[PDB]
Structure formats: structure tokens, C-alpha cells
């Protein structure tokens, strides 16, 4: 076949304009956009197409593209067919088309990214799900599954309603279970809610979701810490199954010298008090968060972006320190690109030795040993090596974003929960855990993963949830 | 839901109670432990500690003092009004061993926070010598309560307008000075009374727990924002403690933490109460 080399573009908000705020950076296709890349597609066969399989729960992407081309004329039929495929596999594309880091699942793996731009599945696939949101139309796919519930009298209960519970819970509603979400926030949404800013995925997309619960009957109780507010053992006794959703929510923090200096946060902190708490709109909103003239974020990941540039929309000059090179960093590529276009400096092969502060207990400089690149590790990346170098840099507010690890005081509480070395849960091939009955999914057995793995498992678990009660 | 508030009682100027319906947290509160609350959809989280339950009555008590925006804003609520969220019980339970001669020092609203403690340490089967310490005469609350659940009650005022004239810090010497048999202190209020309570007791070796109060967001483990350094290692407050033991606390790096926000915090007090001059 002839092959479209440049992928359709996406609109997207001015630097100038978007830095003054926490909107939406990238404004998402068209009708008439998304067509034009939908053409781009060859069609390669189910059986075959590599997207499919680098997509971790194998949505039919051809055939979704394919109902967009095939409705040329009629977008809301359109739109209608290509969800109705992509939901086959996939409960949550508006926010999977919008954060997957594709480089290295479905677009990674496009027969046209060998030459040129691959197709924009993500985008796409966004462009399914916003366009059906606007329109009623994921309403409509929904009501439909809601016809169907046949209630079969079983109760369970879903500890965390991050993507892996919030996806479990509608997969077992519509299953007929009756399903109630503890969660211990005071929102739910987890990382999506918390971690992840509205300047990449809006909150609206998320109270969808919780919207879609509510249609299901699903039920969500927050400000509940089990283990401490409800116990393990008083949620066995009243539910046939649990399916465990707790994520990797702990801070990693190094023991550097000064780390508990004023203006050091963590990047759960600080993404916490700007994404949950709203405390960039302060005094509005009464959770106040403080930053100096410079900032510095430490770490090269989806954390350390999202932390530069909320840093970066409250005022601060910011800098990423990060001990590889820009090749290494783990982010979505999209991403590290907006946060260069917005202004985020960045120092690579860099790490921090100590944190120095001034008379009154407040961050005044980090010093910092240089590196230099190795041998490949075993994530295949070129390791990290201290030169014995180092130097010292101003910086008047630090955010730590070294990656998250889950709660051990949480799974210690929780009797008979084999639990491995890293914190994550233990399970077997249907994310049973030690416990019978006890499943799990999600970050909390996978450490620090994709919302898509954390959807995917918590439609695993539900299926596993209902053979281990059918039978 | 959100959380009614069944009871409101004004102990002392700028010291509320709120009987709060929770019975989960009701059920499985003891005592050192604390919530997280928040009032509506603008404002913050703030934790406070469980003074009392009443598992007949499904509830948790609090007693807020007022010293900012949230506690101030707090203390016009009433009965029948309801708290959006409240989260519970947080920390670990004080540790209740029968120990001897225990004293305990609650400063200002802290005298309402060691009342539960006070209370399972006497049940427990130890000496209880209770130190109360207040600005002012018109500050003084809860004499009697503690005095229920105390052997020995103490109560001082820094300007002598009641009881002992002094600090807390000036009862307790005054105990050690006599040779009085003490094998533990725990002392729970503001920052710079717990620094000095166990800087008094370290020379003497007298085992001191402190119920830590740093900065607390979520208040589960997930941020750090609650971070102190005990026996040079970082620990939570929130999911470690709050309580450790005072003699291993960094106690000048808590309170440093504690004022960072200052600056802020006094422009959202001063925005509240210029938005209601008018009246
Ligand atoms: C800053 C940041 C940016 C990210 N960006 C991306 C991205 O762009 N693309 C991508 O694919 N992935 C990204 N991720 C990873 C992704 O967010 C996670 O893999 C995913 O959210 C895991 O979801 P989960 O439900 O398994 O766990 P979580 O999302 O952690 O959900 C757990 C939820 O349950 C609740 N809970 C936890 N423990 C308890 C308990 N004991 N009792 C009661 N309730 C509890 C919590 O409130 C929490 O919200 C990012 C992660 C972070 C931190
Ligand atoms: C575990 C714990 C238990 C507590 N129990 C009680 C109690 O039973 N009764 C009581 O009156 N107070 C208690 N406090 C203190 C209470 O949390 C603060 O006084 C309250 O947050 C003040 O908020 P504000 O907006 O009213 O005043 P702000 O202006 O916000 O703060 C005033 C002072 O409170 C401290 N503070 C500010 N923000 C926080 C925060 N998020 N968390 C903790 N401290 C903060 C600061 O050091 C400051 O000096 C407790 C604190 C902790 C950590
Ligand atoms: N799961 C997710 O949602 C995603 C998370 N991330 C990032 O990854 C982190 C969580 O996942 P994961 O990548 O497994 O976390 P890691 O434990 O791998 O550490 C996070 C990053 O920080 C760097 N880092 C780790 N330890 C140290 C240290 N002691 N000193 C200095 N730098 C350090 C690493 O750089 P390197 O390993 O390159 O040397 C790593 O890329 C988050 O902080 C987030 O920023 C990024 C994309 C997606
Ligand atoms: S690989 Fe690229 S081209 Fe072949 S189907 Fe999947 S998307 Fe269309
Ligand atoms: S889910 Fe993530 S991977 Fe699967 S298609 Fe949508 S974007 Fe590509
Ligand atoms: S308040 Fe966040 S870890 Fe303690
Ligand atoms: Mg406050």
C-alpha cells in the first residue's frame, strides 16, 4: 500500500495562554481531523495488526478506525460503533487515548511509525470517547448494558477507587453483583483524581465515570481508610469477594542530607495540594502551597513532569534534574515536549548529594554529583555512573518525584496477605490473592504501572470475581 | 454522606467541642488516635483528635481551638450542621502497658486530647498524676473530667490567676524536685511545651512521649507533608505516630516546619474576616 507519512495534527492551546492556568493543553481532533487520520490507516488484518498487539488489552484499533470510516456521513453513528468496539475491551478511553505513553504500546508498534508518524490512536481513540461523552452517546452504549443486569444477590467490595476498582466495579455491576468502592480520600479516582493534572486530564472525564457508577448502582463510600475505619475482617464477613485496588501511593524518599528542609516536597504532596485540594486557586480555595523563585523537581518521569509544570503555572522558574539523559527519561514523550515548550529547563546527569538550607530552616541550595552514562541495565537504558564531581545550585523550593511504592502499613493489617519483598501483592493467574476470595489488580500488584494495566486487571478481577462465586 | 454534628459545647473562649455522628469511627477509635476533617468543597484538611467516643450514641467528640482560618470557621458551626468529610481513626493508639507513676501533661486544647489516654492509663491500673496547663483563668476547662480519671490533678495558669502560677514545665519540676516516683510523661500540646517538657525530663531519664502535631494533608501515609526525624531516621507522623518518644525528636526542625506556611495562612484568616465586616 501507499502510505500518508504525517499524522493529522492536533490542535492545541498557546504556551503564552496555557501557563496562566490548569486547562487542557491539547484540544483533541475534529470530526473532520479525526477522519482525515482515521484514513491513514491500512487496515492491517485482526489477526495480525502489531498496534493491537503493543495496545496491553488488544483493543481492536482497525476496526474501531475502520467504523469511523465506514460513517463517513453520520458521526454520532460513527462515533457509536467505533466506542461500542473499543468498549469491548476498554472502559476508560477518554483518559487512556489522553496518558498511554503510546511510543511504547500501540503507536510504538504502527506499521507507519516505521517511516513516518504513526497513526494517532491515542487521539483517536480520545476523540471516540470525548465526542460520545458531548453527545449522550456513551449514555446511550450504557443504558443498554444497564438493560441487560440480571441482579444475582451477591455482594462485593472494592478497597480503592482508583482505575483498577473504579473499572472492577462496573465490570461486577454489570455482572449483576452489588458492589460498594471504599475509598479512603474524600474524592474518588485515585492517581486520575490526585496525581495526574487537569492540564492533561480533566476532571470532568473522571466524574464521568463516577457519573456511569451511579447509573450502575454501584455505590462509593469515602473517607473510608480500611484497616482503620472498616477492618479487613468486618469486610469479609459481609461481602463474598474483595477485590483489593490500593495502588503504589507511599512516597520513595532517599536519605539525603537537608531532606526536611522548608520547601521540600514530595511530588504526592505537592501534586496532592494543587490537584485535589486546588491550592493554585488559594486563597479561593483554603489549602495554601508555597513556592520560591526557583524551583527544582528531581526525577525524569510522568511524576516529575506533571510536578515541573504545575511548579511552573505558579509563577517559579523550574528546573528538572535528572541523573540520566533526555533519551533515558521515562515521561510521555508528549509530554516532556510540552513541559520544554512551556519553559521547564532541564539538567541531565545530574543527582542530589544534600539539600542545604539557610539560618531559619529554609531550602537555599542542593548540591548536586554528576554522572555519566554506563552500560545498559536491565531496563535496557544506559546506567547512571558518579563521577565524584560536584557542585552546589540555588533553589529556593524542591519536589522529590523518585517514584511511589505501595502501603505497608495498610497490607501488614490485612491477616493472611502474602505480600512480596517490593509490597506488592501476591497472586496467581486469576489475581486470587493468598486469601481465598481476596483478589487484586492494578498498582497495588504491579508497583507503579498504566492506567490501561490498571483498567485491564480490574477487568480481569471481575471475571475472576464471578467464576469463583459461580462455581 | 457528610458528617452531622449532634452536639456543640463551648468549653472555653475559642475552644469548641463537636459530638460528631460517625459510628465507624465510633466503633474503632482508641485512644491517641485522630481524624482528618474538612468543612466543605473550598477548604482544607485539617486534623484534629479524638477526645471521646460514644459507641451507644454512634459518635466521636473533637475540641477545636481556634487559631486560623479552618478552626475559626469551625467554631461558628452548630448542631445540625454537618462536616463534609471526616476521616477515621487515624495514627497509631498510644501504647497502654501498665507502667507505675504515669504523668500527663496536656497544654491548652491538649488537655481535652490526653483525657482518653489519661482515662486507659488509670484503667490499666497506674498512678495518674494529671498536669494541666492554661494561659489564663478563663482558659481553664475539663478540671473536673480529668480529675475523674486522674489520681492527682495540678492545674496551672502562666499568670497565677488560678491554681499553680506557671508553665507545666514548672509542675513537673516541681514533682521531680520533691523525689516523687515518675515513670513516664506524656505530654500533648503545643509544639514548643512538648520541647520543653522532654528537654526537663532528658537529663532526669524519664521515658517522655510526645503526640506530634506537624503539617497534615491526606493524613494516610501517601505524602510526607507530616515528616519529623526521630533518632535521625525519617519518619510520618500520621501512620508512624503521632506519638514517639519526645527525647529522640528533632524538635527544632518541627517547629521550623510547622511555620512555613505562616504568610499564607494569615492572608486567608484576614480574607475571611474582611468578607464578613458587613452585617
Ligand atoms: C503523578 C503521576 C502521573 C502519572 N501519569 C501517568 C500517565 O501519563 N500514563 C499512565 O499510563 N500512567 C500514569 N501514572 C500511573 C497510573 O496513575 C497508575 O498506574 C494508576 O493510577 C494505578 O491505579 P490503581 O487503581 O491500580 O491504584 P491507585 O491509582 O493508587 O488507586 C488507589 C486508590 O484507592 C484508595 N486507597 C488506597 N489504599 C487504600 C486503603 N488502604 N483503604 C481505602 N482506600 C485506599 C486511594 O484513595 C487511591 O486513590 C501516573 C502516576 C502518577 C503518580
Ligand atoms: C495529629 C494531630 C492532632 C491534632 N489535634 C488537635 C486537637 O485535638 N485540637 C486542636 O485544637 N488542634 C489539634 N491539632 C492542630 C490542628 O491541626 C491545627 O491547629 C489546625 O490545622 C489549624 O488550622 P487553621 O486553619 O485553623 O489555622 P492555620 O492558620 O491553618 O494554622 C495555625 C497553626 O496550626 C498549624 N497548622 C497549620 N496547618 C496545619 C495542618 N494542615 N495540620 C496540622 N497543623 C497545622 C501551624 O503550625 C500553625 O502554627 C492537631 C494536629 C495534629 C497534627
Ligand atoms: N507509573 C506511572 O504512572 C509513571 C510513572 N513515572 C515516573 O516514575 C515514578 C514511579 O514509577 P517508577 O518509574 O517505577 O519509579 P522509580 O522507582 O523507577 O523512580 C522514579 C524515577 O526517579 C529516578 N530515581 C529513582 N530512584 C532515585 C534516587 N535514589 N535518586 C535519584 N533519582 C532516582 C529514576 O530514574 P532512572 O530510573 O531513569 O535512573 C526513575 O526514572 C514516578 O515518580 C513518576 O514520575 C513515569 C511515567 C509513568
Ligand atoms: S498498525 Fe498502524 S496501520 Fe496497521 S492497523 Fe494498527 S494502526 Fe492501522
Ligand atoms: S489503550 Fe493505550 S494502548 Fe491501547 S490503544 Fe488506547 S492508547 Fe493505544
Ligand atoms: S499527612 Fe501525608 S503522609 Fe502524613
Ligand atoms: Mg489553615
Not at chain 1, 360 to 369: M, P, R, S
Request: glycine share 10%; charged share 30%.
Amino acid at each position: 500500500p501507499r502510505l500518508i507519512k504525517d499524522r493529522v495534527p492536533t490542535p492545541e492551546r498557546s504556551v503564552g495562554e496555557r501557563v496562566r492556568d490548569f486547562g487542557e493543553v491539547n484540544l483533541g481532533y475534529s470530526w473532520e481531523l479525526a477522519l482525515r487520520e482515521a484514513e491513514r490507516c491500512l487496515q492491517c488484518p485482526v489477526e495480525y495488526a502489531p498496534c493491537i498487539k503493543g495496545c496491553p488489552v488488544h483493543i481492536n484499533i482497525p476496526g474501531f478506525i475502520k467504523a469511523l470510516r465506514e460513517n463517513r456521513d453520520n458521526p454520532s453513528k460513527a462515533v457509536r460503533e467505533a466506542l461500542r468496539i473499543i468498549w469491548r475491551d476498554n472502559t476508560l478511553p477518554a483518559i487512556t487515548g489522553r496518558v498511554c505513553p503510546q511510543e511504547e504500546q500501540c503507536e510504538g508498534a504502527c506499521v507507519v511509525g516505521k517511516v513516518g508518524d504513526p497513526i494517532n490512536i491515542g487521539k483517536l481513540e480520545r476523540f471516540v470517547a470525548d465526542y460520545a461523552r458531548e453527545h449522550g452517546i456513551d449514555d446511550e452504549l450504557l443504558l443498554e448494558e444497564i438493560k441487560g443486569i440480571k441482579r444475582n444477590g451477591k455482594k462485593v467490595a472494592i478497597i480503592g477507587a482508583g482505575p483498577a476498582g473504579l473499572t472492577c466495579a462496573a465490570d461486577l455491576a454489570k455482572m449483576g453483583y452489588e458492589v460498594t468502592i471504599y475509598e479512603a480520600l474524600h474524592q474518588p479516582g485515585g492517581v486520575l483524581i490526585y496525581g495526574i493534572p487537569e492540564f492533561r486530564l480533566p476532571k470532568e472525564i473522571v466524574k464521568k465515570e463516577l457519573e456511569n457508577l451511579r447509573r450502575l448502582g454501584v455505590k462509593i463510600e469515602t473517607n473510608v481508610l480500611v484497616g482503620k475505619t472498616i477492618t479487613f475482617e468486618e469486610l469479609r464477613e459481609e461481602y463474598d469477594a474483595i477485590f483489593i485496588g490500593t495502588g503504589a501511593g507511599t512516597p520513595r524518599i532517599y536519605p539525603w542530607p537537608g531532606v526536611n528542609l522548608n520547601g521540600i516536597y514530595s511530588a504526592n504532596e505537592f501534586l496532592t495540594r494543587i490537584n485535589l485540594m486546588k491550592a493554585y486557586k488559594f486563597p479561593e480555595y483554603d489549602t495554601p502551597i508555597k513556592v520560591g523563585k526557583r524551583v527544582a523537581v528531581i526525577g525524569g518521569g510522568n511524576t516529575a513532569m506533571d510536578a515541573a509544570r504545575s511548579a511552573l503555572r505558579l509563577g517559579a522558574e523550574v528546573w528538572i534534574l535528572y541523573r540520566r539523559t533526555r533519551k533515558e527519561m521515562t515521561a510521555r514523550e508528549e509530554e516532556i515536549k510540552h513541559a520544554e515548550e512551556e519553559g521547564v529547563k532541564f539538567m541531565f546527569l545530574v543527582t542530589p548529594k544534600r539539600f542545604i538550607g539557610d539560618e531559619n530552616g529554609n531550602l537555599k541550595a542542593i548540591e548536586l554529583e554528576k554522572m555519566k552514562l554506563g552500560e545498559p541495565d536491565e531496563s535496557g537504558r544506559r546506567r547512571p555512573i558518579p563521577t565524584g564531581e560536584t557542585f552546589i545550585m540555588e533553589f529556593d523550593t524542591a519536589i522529590i518525584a523518585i517514584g511511589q511504592t505501595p502501603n505497608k502499613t495498610f497490607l501488614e493489617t490485612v491477616p493472611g496477605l502474602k505480600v512480596d519483598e517490593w509490597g506488592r501483592i501476591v497472586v496467581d493467574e486469576n489475581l486470587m490473592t493468598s486469601i481465598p476470595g481476596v483478589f487484586a489488580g492494578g498498582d497495588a500488584i504491579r508497583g507503579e504501572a498504566t492506567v490501561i494495566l490498571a483498567m485491564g486487571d480490574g477487568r480481569k478481577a471481575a471475571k475472576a470475581i464471578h467464576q469463583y462465586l459461580s462455581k | 454522606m457528610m458528617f452531622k454534628i449532634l452536639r456543640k459545647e463551648r468549653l472555653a473562649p475559642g475552644i469548641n467541642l463537636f459530638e460528631i455522628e460517625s459510628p465507624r469511627i465510633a466503633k474503632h477509635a482508641k485512644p491517641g488516635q485522630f481524624v482528618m476533617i474538612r468543612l466543605h468543597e473550598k477548604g482544607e484538611r485539617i486534623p484534629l483528635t479524638i477526645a471521646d467516643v460514644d459507641i451507644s450514641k454512634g459518635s466521636i467528640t473533637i475540641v477545636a481551638q481556634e487559631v486560623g482560618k479552618t478552626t475559626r470557621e469551625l467554631g461558628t458551626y452548630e448542631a445540625g450542621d454537618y462536616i463534609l468529610d471526616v476521616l477515621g481513626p487515624l495514627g497509631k493508639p498510644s501504647h497502654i502497658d501498665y507502667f507505675g507513676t504515669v504523668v500527663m501533661i496536656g497544654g491548652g486544647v491538649g488537655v481535652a486530647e490526653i483525657y482518653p489516654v489519661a482515662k486507659a492509663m488509670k484503667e490499666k491500673g497506674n498512678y495518674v498524676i494529671s498536669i494541666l496547663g492554661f494561659r489564663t483563668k478563663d482558659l481553664v476547662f475539663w478540671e473536673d473530667k480529668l480529675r475523674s480519671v486522674s489520681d492527682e490533678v495540678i492545674v496551672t495558669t502562666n499568670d497565677g490567676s488560678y491554681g499553680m502560677k506557671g508553665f507545666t514545665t514548672h509542675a513537673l519540676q516541681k514533682l521531680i524536685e520533691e523525689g516523687r516516683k515518675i515513670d513516664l510523661v506524656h505530654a500533648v500540646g503545643p509544639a514548643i511545651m512538648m520541647k520543653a517538657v522532654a528537654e526537663l525530663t532528658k537529663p532526669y531519664g524519664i521515658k517522655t512521649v510526645a503526640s506530634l502535631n506537624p503539617i497534615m494533608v491526606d493524613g494516610t501515609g501517601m505524602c510526607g507533608a507530616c515528616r519529623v526525624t526521630v533518632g535521625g531516621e525519617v519518619k510520618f507522623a500520621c501512620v508512624d505516630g503521632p506519638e514517639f518518644d519526645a527525647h529522640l525528636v528533632d524538635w527544632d526542625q518541627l517547629m521550623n516546619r510547622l511555620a512555613y506556611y505562616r504568610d499564607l495562612e494569615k492572608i486567608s484568616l484576614e480574607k475571611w474576616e474582611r468578607e464578613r465586616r458587613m452585617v
